[PDB]
Ligand binder design. Structure first.
Ligand SMILES: [Ca+2]
Ligand SMILES: [Ca+2]
Ligand SMILES: [Ca+2]
Ligand SMILES: [Ca+2]
Ligand SMILES: [Ca+2]
Ligand SMILES: [Ca+2]
Lengths: 163, 151
């Protein structure tokens, strides 16, 4: 399966032509997916807190062409940046998660929406440790630091340098 | 025939329907469990935490998740009492299954959580909660110390 797609998903991911095949072999086999399916599979296999919120945010970054499904092209490239990507690409990858409305800015409420979604999964359970502060207070501390010009919005540059 | 779980036998029918809908082979192994965690945390490396969680699901430790282990795990974690939820979590921390949670084991859990999201310290954090829960200061955590310490 997969012919000259492998060559293409090699130049865009820096995975080898041996790794792209195994990830496809594993993609259609194993466990699996639309938004509903990914959301419920996240609830089943990650039984700590409520992964409902974060599952939605993650799915939307996965589904780049916004068709309601995660094709192999989107999955292998998303996996690429976090595992093989440069620091710049990784911070830009994190930026898309926070930038909910995709306008090139991170607002205080946008960052709060992400932090709180993560907080509900591992930060607020009685089973897993963490945190020490609150998504309310953590975002205020980090926003005050990164927002150099204090305009209430975070650019990619402010986000990158702050990190 | 598992009336032994907080599910009705009307709910059990539906969960098997969903099980064979997910993994039709009836056996999701470590590799399959590992890659979906890659999906659940595409901002780091969920490898460590995926392994730990998988070991708690797979109760008989054969490297596979049968329906029996899957249906019992969902029960305790989603509908179980606080003690039962804390007891199920205890197995996660207790890596070597000796009935204790040691300092490095909990550190192994926290950093595993730290590694999966670490882009968007574990040392100072573990010292804080371990000192709190370990009442007799023997360097080990019992289920009782863990349960009371969490509440
Ligand atoms: Ca898509
Ligand atoms: Ca925005
Ligand atoms: Ca700004
Ligand atoms: Ca098993
Ligand atoms: Ca132990
Ligand atoms: Ca003790």
């Amino acid at each position: 399966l997969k012919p000259e797609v492998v060559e293409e998903l090699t130049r865009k991911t820096y995975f080898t032509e041996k790794e792209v095949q195994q990830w496809y072999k594993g993609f259609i086999k194993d466990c699996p997916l639309d938004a509903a399916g990914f959301q419920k599979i996240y609830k089943q296999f990650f039984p700590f807190g409520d992964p409902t919120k974060f599952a939605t945010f993650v799915f939307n970054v996965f589904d780049e062409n916004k068709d309601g499904r995660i094709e192999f092209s989107e999955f292998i490239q998303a996996l690429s940046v976090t595992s093989r990507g440069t620091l710049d690409e990784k911070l830009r990858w994190a930026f898309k998660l926070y930038d909910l409305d995709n306008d090139g800015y991170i607002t205080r409420n946008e960052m709060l929406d992400i932090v709180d979604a993560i907080y509900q999964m591992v930060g607020n359970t009685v089973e897993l440790p963490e945190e020490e502060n609150t998504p309310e207070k953590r975002v205020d501390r980090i926003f005050a630091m990164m927002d150099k010009n204090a305009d209430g919005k975070l650019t990619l540059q402010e986000f990158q340098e702050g990190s």
